[PDB]
Each structure stands twice: as structure tokens, then as C-alpha cells.
Amino acid sequence: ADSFVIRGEVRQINIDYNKLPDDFTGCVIAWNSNKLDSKVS
């Protein structure tokens, strides 16, 4: 289980900027960071 936050790049995982493509075998569990890891923005 990896732990990263991207911009939105949500169509892909720009991100050659640190190689984890769609045909890599796995599941994507994802949600918005604007409710917990945020501010006004």
C-alpha cells in the first residue's frame, strides 16, 4: 500500500514525474484530500 497525493494527474494515477502506469497489476483506492489534508484551499 503506497501513500501519495497527486494533483486533481487523476486521469493517469505528467505522473514521468515519479512510473506507476495503468497496466501495472493492482487496485486504486482514492479519495479527495480537500476535506482532511487541506485549508481554505
Partner: protein
């Protein structure tokens, strides 16, 4: 332009650099088909609209 009166635009002879474009504020997305975002820097085109 408006949707019904959209302006026609053709791009002429150009040495294109796309790596400076994808991080500009109006050019964040590339949700489409038929071209690749990591391959446009190596392709040649007859014209671009």
C-alpha cells in the same frame, strides 16, 4: 468565442515543446484518444488545429 460561433484556428510551422505546456493552468488535462501525451514531442504533423 461562443459555442455556436467558434473561431477557426490553424497552427503553422512550429517547433513544438509540450513539456512547458502541461503545467500551465489552462492545460492540465489530456483526456482523449488517438494521441499520447508522452509521445507528442517525437511526432510530426501535417497541420494542427
Amino acid at each position: 468565442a461562443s459555442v455556436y460561433a467558434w473561431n477557426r484556428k490553424r497552427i503553422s510551422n512550429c517547433v513544438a515543446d509540450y513539456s512547458v505546456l502541461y503545467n500551465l493552468a489552462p492545460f492540465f488535462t489530456f483526456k482523449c484518444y488517438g494521441v499520447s501525451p508522452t509521445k507528442l514531442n517525437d511526432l510530426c504533423f501535417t497541420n494542427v488545429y
